[PDB]
Amino acid sequence: EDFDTRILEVRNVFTMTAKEGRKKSIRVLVAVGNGKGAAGFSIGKATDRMDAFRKAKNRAVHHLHYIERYEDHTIFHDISLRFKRTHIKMKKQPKGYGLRCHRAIITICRLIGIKDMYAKVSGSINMLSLTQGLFRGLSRQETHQQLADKKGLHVVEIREECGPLPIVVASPRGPLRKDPEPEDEVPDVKLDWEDVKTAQGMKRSVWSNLKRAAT
C-alpha cells in the first residue's frame, strides 16, 4: 500500500505472425516507488493494456532498487552517465529548487522521493534507455559516509547560507588519516561545455529557466 505505480510509456507493438499477419500487442513500461528511496521499473507485454499494467507493476515491485538520498531530498553528488545513446546529467540541488528534469525523470524521482534535482537528457530520448540509465546512475552513486570510509577523512560541508561554519556530514568509522589530501592547484576533471557556458553566462537560451508549474 506504500507503493505508487506510474506509467512511463505505452506502445502498440505489431508483430508479424505466420497465420494472422499483423498482430497487435501492448508493451508498457511502469515504475513503482514508495517515496522513501525504494523504487524500480519493469516492462510488461500483453494483448490487453490492463494485463500489461498488472504484469509490469507486479514485476517491478520485485526489482526494487534503493536510491540513497542526501538529506532525503536530493542526490549525493553530481552524476553524468551515458547509457547506450542517452546522456543523463543530474545535478544535486539545494532544498526548494524543485525538480527541473525530463518529465519521466520527474515521475521516477517523485516515486523515489527526490524533491530537488536538475537533469538534462541529451542524445536519444528512448524512454526505456533513459529510465534504466537513470536507475543505474542513481544506484551507483556514492554516499558521503562511503566516501569518508574510503578515503579515511572527514567530509566537511560548506554552505554559503551558513557562512564559513564547517559542517561535518560524514566521518570515517575506522582510523582517521593524518596526512592531508594533496591539494592540486589544478584539478584533473572532465567538465561539461554546457555547464561552463551557463556559469560564464554565454549560455543564452530562450528555453532555459522558463517559468513552469510546480514540481
Partner: peptide
Amino acid sequence: GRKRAKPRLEQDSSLKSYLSG
C-alpha cells in the same frame, strides 16, 4: 482503389474511457 489507413495511425479511445471514469 480506395484509401487504406496506416495501422500505426488508428485511434484508440481506451485512454479516453479510463480518464472519463
